[PDB]
Design a protein around this ligand. Structure first.
Ligand code: E12
Ligand code: E12
Ligand code: NAG
Ligand code: NAG
Ligand code: NAG
Ligand code: NAG
Lengths: 528, 528
């Protein structure tokens, strides 16, 4: 039977699912690691022990334990990112969508979720892989990994909570896909890993990490890169936040063993309830437990690895959205709110810049303010709101990604860059937020092809172009079928806009502001 | 007789001169101080001893000893600023143009020349006061003062060469106008001092200095202000440059008395020949001997005097030209030349910025470069040439003047601001230089009214509007006759363009760049 597949871990039984009035197979909730529960909390993952009998893979797995957004109860805009399954520390599973009839050797795409390393589920409705697997004929895999303290609490030196285990969870799922995807009709030599936000940073982290490089072929990064300022911390800061988490839960702090034992006895929700208390600064776009530059998963600093070409050399396709920062300002800066146009006074602009560049002295804050203020009209509430939106997006997503692409391209085998700036006709978020962080995902996953969702015909057409670009790139290393999306090169630095208008090619994506964030501001903070 | 006037210093006999097919009287070369020769070189001026008999004032006086531009032998563009009379240390004289018939009590305008405190003559053809005195019916006075080492060598503490004597020369001529102008038909209670470049800085210096304030009524500053970075030095730097001048002429350096005696024995040209050797840095728009913040002519720092309102409170009319920096780049920065379009490579742009902000560390130079570079087109030779032109002009003239006007307006009785951007149809300098430092002077002095000079009819019309604005302001404290030039206010910050097109009013003259030069860059250089 088509729904029965034999893997090196055992037999798995899928389920048939309808898609655009046709059908494909889905294998949901396949375990790839042992449950990281009890004394395994915080430890590296262990491979799932093989089972006899048939694993029922007809239903979505539990989501990992994480913070749940309840800022707008019932609002679809926020709730579409929340876990939609019961949460459990027993959550290391992957999902596979397989074209019907079962392919023999087809391109594989593996999706990595990415809510800032503190949230995410492989089961969200915007991540339903059937539309993409069906439309582009690819085997689509979505994996999972521990987030928050469970995936990134880091006490370097300890083997009990070494840090980066959530990245080791992703790697284990990639090891499993590499070792078993052929039985599902996927080509193990043509696997593309792709992810958005923390998922985009994760993808870049597997490109960098020696131990992950051989498990995949190509990569796609959406609004995220490994060098993002929020994507990693030193082992000293990781240690400091682990100790502070311990202090918040009245743990004995005399030894790593003492701290970890105490943290292992707390119910999951006790850890999540105090997670945001360990940030070192009053800030925005900063998360508590994230990857650590440990000397193992990352052999040296990200920047020296990037400079010396110490990374997998292959093709990459990546890009950003027009208003990456709005989501974070709404949720964490004074003067912004969901139901108003959020016109910001000079005063709120300045407290917003301080929140956005937490690691800055007064001189650095003045440099940012001067750079984004129109001095002939400094009390313009709209310009203040938008300038702050650009500050958050440029500093946290765009300029770090531009620095990664320029460094990568020097040694890689082909780079395609995009700038997504289409505001969906049916967005439920306010107008001032623009093209929000995360809202290109629905186009990548094909949601506009389902009429009940209410997109315009031109949006369905953009979704089809995007899915075909992502799949053709996954399959060949070039998004174009043999109107051209040009290669990004060190000399020309070309990229394309991705929207409902005829393709336009441009050069040097936000160079002006990115020289400020990647070259001047850091020199400034280092001198002072 | 109309050409005979009795003053407190003695009888003076003028000469009748033709002007626009009419005639007026001129009294040229009236002495106002004793010749500052021999043991008087470097000393404060002494009032001219009265004489019996008639002083023949029918011919222009000698010009003070100064550097002579010979970069373009015979070129009118440069030679029009060079002394056109024999040079002599015996040069403290003033010139007066008096309407015919002799007025009884009319508005007086006193012109202060201004070639960077190192050059200037009251006798230049562009300073011929007959057109203005005739057309606007004012008594026009041009004074003179020692420039270079002769006027500003400063060894604070010594009474032999105290510094600022060139400013004391100007003040003595103002004392003489105040005491004697009534005999020429001028109103001593309505005297306006006006000057360009160092002359504009000098005018602001008499507004600041307690000892000069009571000698005049109102003020006009053209492309120059007291707080300009090149307009003054501390007593420690003045002392250092005096000692270095001594060292260049193999002087005994053991005591001030020894140094001064040696310097007094050198012929004038020996001092001028090594003048440029004492600058402390490789630089542009920096002059060797300039006013010193001494605690006497200036009681405290210029900035605290400005902040506390320690200055004459009256009306002022002032402004700048569109391309103040080109003159200096032509003469002192690599890649610029008179007969080419001077397209500047990135390399020359960067060595030009280093020359323009001599007092800057690497971080400060990076801040300037980032501010004036268009990163999407950094190899554009035209943008590089023009960005450097704006850097020199903004830093040396425009932003210092904007800072002076905002501070002054808080305590003054009326401010009128202009931005002169008309490129004369007959300019002999190349196109790339634009509206050059000093080229509004010919319009202020009415040269476009003389047909043989070849200006267009609309230029003659602009000249008439400008002369009438300057004279009406001198007479009433408002350039407008009772199309309006609005008052510059702390809140609105209005100014007008001055050119051949219908008047346009704007706000916040170069605010964007001036926040960089007046607030950010200094904070930057101070922190580092
Ligand atoms: O797989 C996933 C799962 C979720 C998401 C995706 N992907 C991609 C699109 C985005 C989506 N949400 C993440 C971002 C969703 C928007 C950004 C929200 C940040 C988390 C706020 C939680 C409350 C903490 N309140 C304050 C105090 C602590 C510091 C702080 N910092 C701030 O940046 C904002 C608020 C606060
Ligand atoms: O009364 C006057 C008399 C003259 C002038 C006015 N007014 C108003 C208009 C302008 C006119 N010329 C002054 C500026 C005329 C243009 C500016 C020229 C500056 C002096 C250069 C002399 C040579 C010294 N050569 C180098 C080495 C020393 C440092 C250095 N620094 C530089 O800024 C340029 C060159 C050099
Ligand atoms: C990719 O690599 C192949 C062989 O290693 C080479 O022929 C090709 O030019 C490369 N393409 C790019 C864009 O570097
Ligand atoms: C100037 O001063 C007079 C009297 O001191 C006052 O009535 C007038 O308003 C002032 N004008 C300005 C522009 O300050
Ligand atoms: C497996 O799970 C689904 C849902 O819980 C159930 O409907 C299905 O019949 C089960 N199949 C077997 C044979 O376990
Ligand atoms: C004074 O000087 C001028 C020129 O040197 C001369 O022509 C004129 O006649 C002289 N007048 C007297 C009486 O000194």
């Amino acid at each position: 039977s088509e729904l029965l597949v034999n893997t090196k871990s055992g037999k798995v039984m899928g389920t048939r699912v309808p898609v655009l009035s046709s059908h494909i197979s889905a294998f949901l909730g396949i375990p790839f690691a042992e449950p990281p529960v009890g004394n395994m909390r915080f430890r590296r993952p262990e491979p799932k022990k093989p089972w006899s009998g048939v694993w029922n893979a007809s239903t979505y797995p539990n989501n990992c334990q994480q913070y749940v957004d309840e800022q707008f109860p019932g609002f679809s805009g926020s709730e579409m990112w929340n876990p939609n399954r019961e949460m459990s520390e027993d959550c290391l599973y992957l999902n596979i969508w397989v074209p019907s009839p079962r392919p023999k050797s087809t391109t594989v795409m593996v999706w990595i979720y990415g809510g800032g390393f503190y949230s995410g589920s492989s089961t969200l409705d915007v991540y339903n892989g059937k539309y993409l697997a069906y439309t582009e004929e690819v085997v689509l895999v979505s994996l999972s990994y521990r987030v928050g303290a469970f995936g990134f609490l880091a006490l370097h030196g300890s083997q009990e909570a070494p840090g980066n285990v959530g990245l080791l969870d992703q790697r284990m799922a990639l090891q499993w896909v590499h070792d078993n995807i052929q039985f599902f009709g996927g080509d193990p030599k043509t696997v593309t890993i792709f992810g958005e936000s923390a998922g985009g940073a994760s993808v870049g982290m597997h490109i960098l990490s020696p131990g992950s490089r051989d498990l995949f072929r190509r990569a796609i990064l959406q609004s995220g890169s490994p060098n993002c300022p929020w994507a990693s911390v030193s082992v000293a800061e990781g240690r400091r936040r682990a100790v502070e988490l311990g202090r918040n839960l009245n743990c004995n702090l005399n030894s790593d063993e003492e701290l970890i034992h105490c943290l292992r006895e707390k119910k999951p929700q006790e850890l999540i309830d105090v997670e945001w208390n360990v940030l070192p600064f009053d800030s925005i776009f900063r998360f508590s437990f994230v990857p650590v530059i440990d000397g193992e998963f990352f052999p040296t600093s990200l920047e020296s690895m990037l400079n010396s070409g110490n990374f997998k050399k292959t093709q990459i396709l990546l890009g950003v959205n027009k208003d990456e920062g709005s989501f974070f300002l709404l949720y964490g800066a004074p003067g912004f709110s969901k139901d108003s146009e959020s016109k910001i006074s000079r005063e709120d602009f300045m407290s917003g810049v301080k929140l956005s560049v937490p690691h800055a002295n007064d001189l650095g804050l003045d440099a940012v303010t001067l750079q984004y203020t129109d001095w002939m009209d400094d009390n313009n509430g709209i310009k203040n709101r938008d300038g702050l939106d650009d500050i958050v997006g440029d500093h946290n997503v765009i300029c770090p990604l531009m620095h990664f692409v320029n460094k990568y391209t020097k040694f890689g085998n082909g780079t395609y860059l995009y700038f997504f700036n289409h505001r969906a006709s049916n967005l439920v978020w306010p107008e001032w937020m623009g093209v929000i962080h995360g809202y290109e995902i629905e186009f990548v996953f094909g949601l506009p092809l389902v009429k009940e969702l209410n997109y315009t015909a031109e949006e369905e057409a953009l979704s089809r172009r995007i899915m075909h670009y992502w799949a053709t790139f996954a399959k060949t290393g070039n998004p174009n079928e043999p109107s051209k999306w040009p290669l990004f090169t060190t000399k020309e630095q070309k990229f394309i806009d991705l929207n409902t208008e005829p393709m336009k090619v441009h050069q040097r994506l936000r160079v002006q502001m990115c020289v400020f964030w990647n070259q001047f501001l850091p020199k400034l903070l280092n001198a002072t």
